[PDB]
């Protein structure tokens, strides 16, 4: 996260860390949506251009963290995966369209003051909050600059940008399964997710029922916090039927 600050303890109790077993490293961010399911970005698990194709056996999920490198004994839980589901039409060849994956944990995790799931939006909450100008929050342990790394979880609140502005900032083809967020060069405010934050959550707090909803998944951006550029996120509500389907099917 660039130009974001340290998170508070228990601020994003749904933040998950995808950890690789050997080498032991942070792979991506993810979020806890139930006691057995985690949602992340599919490019964190499968990205052929760079020979990335992880299986159940190569990842570990760490929930309840704050600190990036320490094993927070008695606070965090580490779960193993049972199955990984990548959206059938995830497009890695061209623009990372439908960059979403679900991971089923081996065993349910117990919630605590540090582990609690986020809500997935329903048509009406999506419709009322995903508006240009409304701010959302992104969290992660990713890089602090494009070109070090934080010791603690970082948070940044970014405004959602109008789609034409998003499209006119890149040469990549934007689809309706993506949205972009960030400040204009012109708003003398900065912030963006960056490398290491892919897969994590973009959430908004409903002013109707005070709950936090995960509207997006950190997907991509060109550089980190470059002026004139924005971060793109997968549109969770547009892929919600796929989500509902693998959950009640599996």
């Amino acid at each position: 996260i660039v130009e974001g600050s340290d998170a508070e303890i228990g601020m994003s109790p749904w933040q998950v860390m995808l950890f690789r077993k050997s080498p032991q490293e942070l792979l991506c961010g993810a979020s806890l949506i139930s006691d057995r399911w985690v949602l992340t970005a599919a490019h964190c698990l499968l990205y052929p251009p760079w020979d990335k194709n992880f299986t159940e056996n190569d990842l570990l999920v760490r929930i309840g963290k704050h600190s990036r490198t320490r094993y927070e004994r008695n606070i965090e839980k580490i779960s193993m995966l049972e199955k990984i589901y990548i959206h059938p039409r995830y497009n890695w060849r061209e623009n990372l369209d439908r960059d979403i994956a679900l991971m089923k944990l081996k065993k349910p995790v117990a919630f605590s003051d540090y582990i609690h799931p986020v809500c997935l939006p329903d048509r009406e909450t999506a419709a009322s909050l995903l508006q240009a100008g409304y701010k959302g929050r992104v969290t992660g342990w990713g890089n602090l600059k494009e070109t070090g790394q934080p010791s603690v979880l970082q948070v940044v609140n970014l405004p959602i940008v109008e789609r034409p502005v998003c499209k006119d900032s890149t040469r990549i083809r934007i689809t309706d399964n993506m949205f972009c967020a960030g400040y204009k060069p012109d708003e003398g405010k900065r912030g963006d997710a960056c490398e290491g934050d892919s897969g994590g959550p973009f959430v908004m707090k409903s002013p109707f029922n005070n709950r936090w909803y995960q509207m997006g998944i950190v997907s991509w951006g060109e550089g980190c916090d470059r002026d004139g550029k924005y971060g793109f996120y997968t549109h969770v509500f547009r892929l919600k039927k796929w989500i509902q389907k693998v959950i009640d099917q599996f």
């Binding site: 570990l60 320490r70 193993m80 790394q149």
Partner: peptide, 11 residues
Amino acid sequence: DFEEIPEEYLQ
């Protein structure tokens, strides 16, 4: 940079 995590989580 990452501290060691308990062996029971590798197996």
